[PDB]
Amino acid sequence: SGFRKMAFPSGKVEGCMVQVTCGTTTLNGLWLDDVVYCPRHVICTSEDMLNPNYEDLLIRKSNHNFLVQAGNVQLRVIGHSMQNCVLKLKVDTANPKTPKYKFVRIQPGQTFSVLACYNGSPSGVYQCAMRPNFTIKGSFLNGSCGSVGFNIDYDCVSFCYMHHMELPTGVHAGTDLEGNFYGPFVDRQTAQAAGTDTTITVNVLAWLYAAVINGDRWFLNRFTTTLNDFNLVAMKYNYEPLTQDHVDILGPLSAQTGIAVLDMCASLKELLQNGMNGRTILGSALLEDEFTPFDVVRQC
Amino acid sequence: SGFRKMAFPSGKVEGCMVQVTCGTTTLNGLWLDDVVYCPRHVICTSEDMLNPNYEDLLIRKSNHNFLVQAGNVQLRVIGHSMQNCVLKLKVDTANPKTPKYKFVRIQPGQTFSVLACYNGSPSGVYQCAMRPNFTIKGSFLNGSCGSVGFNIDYDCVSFCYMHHMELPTGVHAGTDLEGNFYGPFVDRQTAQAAGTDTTITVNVLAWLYAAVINGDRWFLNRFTTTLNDFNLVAMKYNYEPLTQDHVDILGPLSAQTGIAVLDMCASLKELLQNGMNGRTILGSALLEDEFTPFDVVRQC
């Protein structure tokens, strides 16, 4: 049936994107009920970003200094406050397109869809994973700040990410919708390290199971292994240690394929120790770790 | 700033998806104005699909045999007709969410977004390319038929694909919105071959330019080549021949990087002849050919 990196439908989130402008700085805002959420560095000039005192900078701003536009209509700002690294602009109009929503802080290794936006207008959608080092590998140009990441559960939108900054390695960092950064990062223009990134081991196994469901089986061998034995190989290749919780989460995939989790670990161990010898798996010549077990169960 | 496979925002298309049922056969329909478009094999039983006479099978159907559901409301079918491989069901209510739209027949090598749906409900969005052999590599389970592919130009949805069938190689085939299949395929449950697939050469070059824009430059050498010399190497690897039109389309990318197109052709030739030596390009260990030059210009 095929296996693709697949983002959630973005219609519910498109109706929440607005444009926020302070001075000459413009970015995206999230309009839910009567509040607009956006990164607080919208109040900074180019020079302020080098070493900003956000409390001092925000004091110089009043409600009428924030211009919020939803398409072509201008929203009236009647209040403003700073919550960690995000601004909350209270407006006089409730967003009639507000979906059922919640704010969640996502865990490392989990995935979400990003609605990349510019000037408050949606540009595209793609799926990302919160890396173990709390960065993401997305596509964010200038003015994309304020773009949000989300999951959908039935009818409810779980917002979990708002984009703030790009790291020198080419990766991105942001906050949850309460303004708390994922990872150790701060919203200041200064060199910051993300640290050693790990491979999400349970995600690689889930993707290997997806391949078997689609008929890719050449990487399967006759060995098995133990949890401690595979983890001695996981630690060596900067993979995350596998736990019994991970084994349980892979339960539906192991049942569908008839391949025991430890049997798949031995095949992954061989793949790690010997490589892929020029072959491909699900159209990839690398081991993919940005599909959660739940993502695989959704498509297979 | 990063480079990702990025689908169009699906909100305009979500509002057009309906459920079409004929007997037990249920699939997706596209509701625009007062017509619902769906694959004609919705009128087939499992046995009919082995060797269907669609004209004979459709004659046994009347308007009340088609159940069209938009969410929870049942649309009233007041007419039906067959256009090539799609059915057009005329309904008594115009879709109030109908966007500005047109039907286009896409060319091989071009890309589009797919809104995968089941039972008339959107499940996910992803980007696809029309392969030179007129197949696509998507994610389509049973009941996904009727899902559509599209591009967005500003405010206008260009529908170009409707999903019909899965091929024995794991790839997918469908029609334009006039019901004409892309490629030599027919809507019958019988073994069908897609033919040799070609690599979209201009797309590989565009993606190599995207890598240079993002700072990936290891594959660049000090050679150049000619159009005919590269094509002698393209044909060997089942790549499409490069033309001056392709060189012109790559103009914006060659200008931004300062790398002449024939200079980039020499790096690709060496990548084809020598492999990638365990290295990666934009996070891939394979040469990606599903980004058009326009797709690269958009994200860069």
XYZ file of C-alpha atoms in Angstrom:
600
model
C 0.000 0.000 0.000
C 3.049 2.253 0.397
C 4.596 4.116 3.323
C 5.139 7.881 3.291
C 5.973 10.677 5.691
C 2.471 12.073 6.092
C 1.397 15.272 7.837
C -1.974 15.902 9.430
C -4.615 17.821 7.456
C -3.946 21.495 8.119
C -7.401 23.022 7.626
C -8.137 23.527 11.321
C -4.782 25.263 11.847
C -4.916 27.438 8.703
C -7.891 29.312 10.165
C -5.823 30.250 13.233
C -2.813 31.888 11.560
C -2.486 35.672 11.740
C 0.256 38.215 11.091
C 1.855 40.150 13.960
C 3.978 43.283 13.348
C 5.889 45.456 15.896
C 7.885 48.165 14.168
C 9.388 46.615 11.221
C 9.534 43.120 12.698
C 6.796 40.791 11.368
C 6.081 37.131 12.140
C 3.187 34.722 12.537
C 0.685 34.525 15.361
C -1.725 31.846 16.544
C -5.243 33.167 17.096
C -7.331 31.112 19.483
C -10.397 32.498 21.200
C -9.501 36.074 22.049
C -5.773 35.713 22.325
C -2.993 35.821 19.825
C 0.197 33.898 20.632
C 3.517 34.701 18.955
C 7.250 34.705 19.772
C 8.218 37.543 22.082
C 11.183 38.569 19.926
C 8.715 40.332 17.606
C 9.396 43.374 19.829
C 13.130 43.337 19.048
C 15.001 45.257 16.391
C 17.910 43.627 14.655
C 20.280 45.064 17.201
C 18.096 44.097 20.182
C 18.347 40.415 19.223
C 22.082 40.335 20.012
C 21.469 40.710 23.773
C 17.836 41.556 24.598
C 16.334 42.466 27.949
C 12.782 41.451 27.098
C 11.253 42.900 30.269
C 12.802 46.300 29.532
C 11.954 46.116 25.820
C 8.312 45.127 26.373
C 7.810 47.982 28.853
C 8.391 50.414 26.045
C 5.479 48.855 24.125
C 1.749 49.493 24.495
C -1.286 47.753 23.019
C -1.440 50.008 19.951
C 2.181 49.150 19.070
C 1.083 45.626 18.059
C -0.574 45.349 14.635
C -2.483 42.070 14.245
C -4.056 41.329 10.846
C -6.117 38.254 9.957
C -6.025 38.255 6.185
C -7.123 41.813 5.385
C -8.993 42.681 8.598
C -7.165 44.391 11.481
C -7.721 43.080 15.013
C -7.791 45.524 17.933
C -5.279 44.748 20.694
C -6.752 45.441 24.141
C -4.087 43.764 26.272
C -0.662 42.192 26.193
C 1.492 40.097 28.563
C 4.699 37.976 28.351
C 4.606 34.293 29.331
C 8.067 32.874 29.266
C 9.183 33.278 25.659
C 5.826 34.001 24.037
C 3.605 37.108 23.877
C -0.136 36.880 24.492
C -2.024 39.718 22.799
C -5.636 39.942 23.928
C -7.886 41.057 21.072
C -11.463 42.314 21.004
C -12.701 39.596 18.610
C -12.869 35.878 19.310
C -11.626 33.786 16.398
C -14.811 32.197 14.968
C -12.629 29.470 13.403
C -11.190 28.397 16.770
C -11.172 24.574 16.791
C -11.248 22.353 19.832
C -7.675 22.601 21.012
C -5.262 21.980 23.850
C -1.670 22.917 24.623
C 0.673 19.969 25.157
C 4.395 19.720 25.824
C 5.599 16.933 23.551
C 8.195 14.352 24.565
C 11.485 13.748 22.726
C 11.072 11.177 19.977
C 7.448 12.101 19.263
C 6.307 13.559 15.951
C 4.047 16.413 14.879
C 3.009 18.328 11.766
C 4.281 21.853 11.062
C 2.228 24.440 9.166
C 4.991 26.654 7.788
C 3.686 30.207 7.405
C 4.960 33.570 6.180
C 3.313 36.942 6.881
C 0.462 34.999 8.490
C -0.227 33.013 5.310
C 0.164 29.214 5.181
C 2.937 28.015 2.874
C 3.171 24.250 3.379
C 2.827 21.293 5.729
C 5.331 18.620 6.744
C 5.965 16.152 9.556
C 8.777 16.663 12.063
C 10.102 14.825 15.100
C 11.303 16.335 18.358
C 14.903 15.102 18.338
C 16.337 13.683 21.581
C 18.440 16.864 21.793
C 15.215 18.925 21.514
C 15.835 20.314 18.032
C 13.839 19.708 14.864
C 14.895 19.363 11.225
C 12.390 21.527 9.388
C 12.274 24.183 6.663
C 12.032 27.700 8.125
C 13.022 30.853 6.255
C 12.976 34.366 7.698
C 9.501 35.368 8.815
C 8.523 31.748 9.511
C 8.725 32.342 13.272
C 5.358 31.838 14.916
C 4.615 28.786 12.773
C 3.154 26.044 14.949
C 3.475 22.279 15.216
C 0.475 20.176 16.132
C -1.220 16.802 16.296
C -4.819 16.040 15.636
C -6.827 13.549 17.616
C -10.190 13.208 16.026
C -11.457 16.739 16.284
C -9.018 18.208 18.770
C -5.867 20.059 17.822
C -2.960 19.552 20.198
C -0.569 22.452 19.660
C 2.901 21.518 20.914
C 5.451 23.679 19.067
C 6.040 27.283 18.024
C 9.083 28.148 15.939
C 11.592 30.683 17.277
C 15.120 30.210 15.956
C 17.598 28.414 13.696
C 20.756 26.794 15.005
C 24.208 26.935 13.347
C 23.984 23.231 12.489
C 20.973 23.995 10.288
C 18.438 22.699 12.810
C 15.613 24.593 14.478
C 14.469 25.322 18.026
C 11.244 26.597 19.521
C 8.881 26.551 22.477
C 5.657 24.964 23.577
C 2.586 27.188 23.535
C 3.324 28.319 27.104
C 6.589 29.850 25.883
C 8.980 27.300 27.406
C 11.793 26.340 25.046
C 12.397 22.720 24.194
C 15.973 22.052 25.227
C 18.516 24.457 26.703
C 18.067 27.262 24.181
C 17.340 30.965 24.727
C 15.916 33.544 22.318
C 19.088 35.571 21.796
C 21.301 35.950 18.719
C 24.343 34.125 20.089
C 26.088 30.848 19.300
C 24.360 27.949 21.077
C 25.120 24.227 21.005
C 22.412 21.590 20.690
C 24.635 18.772 21.954
C 25.063 15.240 20.678
C 21.932 14.039 18.916
C 20.773 10.483 19.526
C 18.882 8.160 17.207
C 15.346 7.324 18.359
C 15.751 3.545 18.530
C 12.082 2.611 18.992
C 11.282 4.725 15.927
C 13.833 2.883 13.775
C 12.313 -0.451 14.804
C 8.808 0.817 14.024
C 10.030 1.888 10.578
C 11.715 -1.486 10.029
C 8.379 -3.112 10.864
C 6.660 -0.816 8.356
C 9.108 -2.076 5.726
C 8.271 -5.714 6.473
C 4.548 -4.927 6.249
C 5.279 -3.490 2.787
C 7.297 -6.532 1.666
C 10.853 -5.347 2.411
C 12.535 -8.261 4.201
C 16.127 -8.584 2.947
C 17.550 -7.135 6.194
C 15.992 -9.922 8.294
C 18.452 -12.542 9.531
C 18.541 -15.703 11.658
C 19.946 -14.122 14.821
C 18.212 -12.883 17.926
C 19.630 -10.835 20.789
C 18.900 -9.632 24.310
C 17.914 -6.183 25.534
C 21.249 -5.626 27.286
C 23.197 -7.056 24.333
C 21.492 -4.802 21.783
C 21.898 -1.775 24.070
C 25.652 -2.386 24.197
C 25.479 -1.901 20.427
C 22.924 0.927 20.699
C 25.152 2.977 23.019
C 28.090 2.535 20.649
C 26.238 4.025 17.653
C 24.565 6.807 19.700
C 21.182 5.072 19.678
C 18.806 5.413 22.607
C 18.659 2.409 24.971
C 15.713 0.117 24.342
C 13.412 -0.553 27.294
C 10.572 -2.972 27.963
C 8.170 -0.052 27.511
C 9.505 0.305 23.957
C 9.066 -3.446 23.430
C 5.446 -3.150 24.580
C 4.757 -0.163 22.310
C 6.033 -2.184 19.340
C 3.542 -4.924 20.292
C 0.985 -4.261 17.541
C 3.725 -4.188 14.893
C 5.423 -7.336 16.201
C 2.067 -9.145 16.215
C 1.137 -8.054 12.684
C 4.483 -9.222 11.275
C 5.093 -12.229 13.519
C 8.624 -10.904 14.107
C 9.663 -10.711 17.753
C 11.070 -7.354 18.840
C 14.394 -8.896 19.876
C 14.577 -10.638 16.493
C 14.225 -7.246 14.797
C 16.852 -5.824 17.165
C 19.319 -8.422 15.869
C 18.578 -7.343 12.294
C 19.041 -3.689 13.257
C 22.273 -4.623 15.049
C 23.544 -6.254 11.860
C 22.452 -3.179 9.874
C 24.371 -0.981 12.323
C 27.490 -3.171 12.348
C 27.603 -4.081 8.637
C 25.742 -1.301 6.820
C 23.160 -1.645 4.066
C 25.516 -2.726 1.233
C 24.042 -0.344 -1.328
C 20.453 -1.553 -0.921
C 17.434 0.531 0.165
C 14.610 0.129 2.697
C 11.221 1.731 1.943
C 12.992 3.853 -0.653
C 15.703 5.035 1.754
C 19.399 4.187 1.993
C 19.484 5.326 5.645
C 17.808 4.166 8.847
C 14.764 6.397 9.405
C 13.959 7.389 12.998
C 11.218 10.016 12.535
C 8.260 7.589 12.456
C 6.798 6.720 15.842
C 5.146 3.321 16.379
C 1.805 5.153 16.389
C 2.657 6.761 13.035
C 3.366 3.319 11.568
C 0.117 1.850 12.924
C -1.770 4.716 11.261
C -0.544 3.854 7.742
C -0.001 0.086 7.845
C 17.179 27.212 6.663
C 16.443 23.510 5.948
C 14.916 21.636 3.023
C 11.939 19.292 3.383
C 9.334 17.579 1.244
C 6.441 19.958 1.827
C 2.801 19.538 0.827
C 0.357 22.340 0.131
C -2.074 23.379 2.882
C -5.056 21.065 2.494
C -7.840 23.190 3.995
C -9.446 24.102 0.671
C -9.483 20.440 -0.385
C -10.733 19.059 2.955
C -14.032 20.910 2.481
C -14.624 19.091 -0.819
C -14.271 15.464 0.328
C -17.412 13.325 0.572
C -18.248 9.640 0.960
C -19.775 7.690 -1.941
C -21.316 4.253 -1.375
C -22.712 1.771 -3.907
C -23.771 -1.454 -2.221
C -20.894 -2.345 0.080
C -18.316 -0.520 -2.060
C -17.441 2.777 -0.358
C -14.819 5.277 -1.507
C -14.140 9.018 -1.582
C -15.728 11.653 -3.785
C -14.818 15.210 -4.731
C -17.704 17.678 -4.255
C -17.424 20.807 -6.325
C -20.400 22.968 -7.139
C -23.252 20.543 -7.662
C -21.320 17.527 -8.850
C -19.531 14.713 -7.045
C -16.602 13.069 -8.847
C -15.468 9.567 -7.894
C -13.855 6.482 -9.460
C -16.346 4.554 -11.553
C -15.425 1.215 -9.961
C -17.561 2.149 -6.940
C -20.348 0.349 -8.850
C -18.363 -2.912 -8.916
C -18.626 -5.854 -6.581
C -15.454 -7.775 -5.762
C -16.262 -10.192 -8.599
C -17.075 -7.411 -11.083
C -13.574 -5.958 -10.678
C -12.001 -9.043 -12.289
C -13.438 -8.192 -15.728
C -15.969 -5.342 -15.575
C -18.199 -4.077 -18.363
C -18.757 -0.642 -16.861
C -21.438 0.417 -19.350
C -23.479 -2.710 -18.600
C -22.881 -2.417 -14.848
C -23.812 1.276 -14.692
C -27.085 0.717 -16.569
C -28.315 -1.382 -13.606
C -27.809 1.660 -11.346
C -30.188 4.565 -10.783
C -29.720 7.823 -8.889
C -31.037 6.384 -5.619
C -28.413 3.605 -5.712
C -25.666 6.167 -4.977
C -25.394 7.210 -1.322
C -23.408 10.450 -0.996
C -22.618 11.669 2.518
C -20.878 14.941 3.411
C -20.015 14.385 7.041
C -23.427 13.443 8.437
C -25.750 15.013 5.829
C -27.003 12.855 2.960
C -26.850 14.582 -0.415
C -29.643 13.847 -2.885
C -28.442 12.413 -6.209
C -30.499 13.821 -9.090
C -28.321 12.614 -11.965
C -25.382 10.439 -12.888
C -23.122 9.933 -15.889
C -19.839 8.296 -16.681
C -16.851 10.251 -18.101
C -14.017 7.873 -19.005
C -13.110 6.282 -15.686
C -14.891 8.695 -13.308
C -18.529 9.010 -12.381
C -20.152 12.380 -12.091
C -23.080 12.387 -9.654
C -25.223 15.504 -9.916
C -26.564 16.524 -6.505
C -29.267 18.978 -5.471
C -26.980 21.124 -3.276
C -23.981 23.150 -4.397
C -20.983 22.722 -2.113
C -20.809 25.988 -0.114
C -17.084 25.355 0.456
C -16.262 25.087 -3.260
C -12.974 26.951 -3.821
C -11.720 28.522 -6.997
C -10.595 25.458 -8.919
C -9.618 24.051 -12.287
C -8.893 20.611 -13.710
C -5.410 20.120 -15.151
C -3.626 17.130 -16.644
C -0.175 17.199 -15.082
C 2.996 16.391 -17.004
C 5.431 13.624 -16.011
C 8.077 14.884 -13.618
C 5.773 17.444 -12.000
C 4.772 17.243 -8.347
C 1.509 17.637 -6.459
C 0.032 17.173 -2.994
C -2.209 14.229 -2.081
C -4.929 14.455 0.566
C -5.333 10.810 1.550
C -8.898 10.135 2.709
C -10.919 7.201 4.012
C -14.732 7.064 4.138
C -14.766 10.699 3.017
C -12.601 11.834 5.951
C -9.104 13.294 5.461
C -6.288 11.246 6.992
C -3.070 12.972 5.925
C -1.238 15.035 3.324
C 1.975 14.318 1.439
C 3.796 15.347 -1.699
C 4.031 13.057 -4.776
C 5.568 13.240 -8.234
C 4.113 11.900 -11.463
C 6.832 9.422 -12.427
C 7.986 9.305 -16.064
C 6.198 5.933 -16.270
C 2.997 7.653 -15.029
C 2.876 6.015 -11.600
C 3.170 7.590 -8.160
C 4.747 6.370 -4.918
C 2.119 7.190 -2.324
C 0.333 5.709 0.688
C -3.089 4.304 -0.241
C -4.907 1.608 1.725
C -8.256 0.068 0.818
C -10.951 2.723 0.675
C -8.450 5.432 -0.296
C -9.743 5.547 -3.882
C -11.201 8.921 -4.760
C -8.451 10.752 -2.885
C -7.190 13.592 -5.049
C -3.891 15.241 -5.894
C -3.663 18.983 -6.342
C -1.545 22.111 -6.559
C -2.393 25.556 -5.155
C -1.645 28.743 -7.103
C -2.516 31.559 -4.720
C -6.188 30.921 -4.233
C -6.885 28.391 -6.957
C -6.855 24.615 -6.549
C -5.637 22.767 -9.650
C -6.928 19.221 -9.248
C -4.773 16.881 -11.326
C -5.051 13.369 -9.852
C -7.664 10.965 -8.502
C -6.532 7.651 -7.046
C -7.827 4.401 -8.576
C -5.488 1.443 -8.150
C -2.315 -0.140 -6.784
C 0.204 -1.862 -9.031
C 2.022 -5.137 -8.247
C 5.273 -3.210 -7.729
C 3.739 -1.297 -4.812
C 3.170 1.869 -6.838
C -0.118 3.599 -7.584
C -2.079 4.689 -10.644
C -4.989 7.019 -11.225
C -6.707 9.468 -13.541
C -7.069 13.170 -14.087
C -10.380 14.715 -13.080
C -11.789 13.943 -16.540
C -11.301 10.230 -15.843
C -8.387 9.620 -18.216
C -5.731 7.390 -16.680
C -2.165 8.575 -16.516
C -0.214 5.914 -18.372
C -1.400 2.705 -20.022
C -3.451 1.396 -17.108
C -7.093 0.277 -16.998
C -9.442 -0.056 -14.020
C -9.619 -3.853 -13.950
C -8.238 -6.359 -11.432
C -5.613 -7.892 -13.698
C -1.824 -7.945 -13.715
C -0.519 -4.750 -15.322
C 3.043 -3.552 -15.871
C 4.188 0.055 -15.543
C 7.348 -0.259 -17.642
C 10.855 0.941 -16.897
C 10.871 3.981 -14.649
C 13.176 6.853 -15.528
C 14.870 9.241 -13.128
C 13.720 12.850 -13.539
C 17.139 14.340 -14.295
C 16.175 18.014 -14.010
C 14.673 17.269 -10.590
C 17.901 15.663 -9.353
C 19.861 18.728 -10.467
C 17.366 21.049 -8.767
C 17.756 19.044 -5.552
C 21.555 19.171 -5.845
C 21.232 22.950 -6.131
C 19.053 22.949 -3.006
C 21.840 21.100 -1.187
C 24.427 23.701 -2.210
C 22.104 26.481 -1.030
C 21.949 24.719 2.351
C 25.744 24.366 2.574
C 26.194 20.787 1.299
C 29.031 20.966 -1.240
C 31.169 17.811 -0.919
C 29.886 16.390 -4.226
C 31.129 19.404 -6.221
C 34.210 18.654 -8.332
C 36.453 20.630 -10.694
C 35.076 19.058 -13.891
C 32.542 20.183 -16.452
C 30.798 18.370 -19.292
C 28.612 18.894 -22.348
C 24.906 18.265 -22.840
C 25.567 15.349 -25.196
C 28.355 13.897 -23.036
C 26.178 13.941 -19.915
C 23.218 12.462 -21.804
C 25.440 9.592 -22.937
C 25.856 8.962 -19.202
C 22.213 9.751 -18.356
C 20.862 7.054 -20.698
C 23.154 4.447 -19.138
C 21.607 5.035 -15.699
C 18.000 5.346 -16.962
C 18.006 9.110 -16.406
C 15.980 11.419 -18.616
C 18.018 13.276 -21.267
C 18.767 16.885 -20.390
C 17.608 19.590 -22.806
C 18.217 23.320 -23.125
C 14.722 23.858 -21.720
C 15.862 22.034 -18.572
C 18.984 24.217 -18.429
C 16.786 27.320 -18.694
C 14.418 26.158 -15.939
C 17.432 25.656 -13.662
C 18.469 29.269 -14.368
C 17.334 30.760 -11.044
C 19.154 28.031 -9.100
C 22.328 28.264 -11.193
C 22.294 32.037 -10.661
C 21.798 31.843 -6.890
C 24.639 29.331 -6.435
C 26.998 30.583 -9.140
C 27.329 26.989 -10.391
C 26.797 26.515 -14.119
C 24.284 23.820 -15.038
C 26.870 21.847 -17.014
C 29.209 22.146 -14.030
C 26.488 20.593 -11.869
C 25.968 17.912 -14.518
C 29.596 16.838 -14.052
C 29.151 16.395 -10.294
C 26.023 14.314 -10.919
C 27.867 12.196 -13.494
C 30.582 11.503 -10.918
C 27.910 10.714 -8.320
C 26.357 8.266 -10.791
C 29.671 6.658 -11.774
C 31.327 6.679 -8.329
C 28.435 6.507 -5.866
C 28.166 8.610 -2.729
C 30.845 6.775 -0.685
C 28.673 6.418 2.408
C 28.033 10.170 2.569
C 24.660 11.921 2.541
C 23.125 14.891 0.731
C 20.387 16.882 2.497
C 19.958 13.961 4.877
C 19.602 11.419 2.059
C 21.958 8.686 0.867
C 20.103 8.499 -2.470
C 19.687 10.976 -5.315
C 16.236 12.539 -4.896
C 14.234 13.276 -8.057
C 10.825 14.289 -6.645
C 11.589 18.006 -6.187
C 10.910 20.137 -9.244
C 12.978 23.288 -9.841
C 9.876 25.264 -8.864
C 9.645 23.310 -5.592
C 13.267 24.193 -4.793
C 12.830 27.890 -5.632
C 9.826 28.000 -3.286
C 11.679 26.725 -0.211
C 14.965 28.503 -0.990
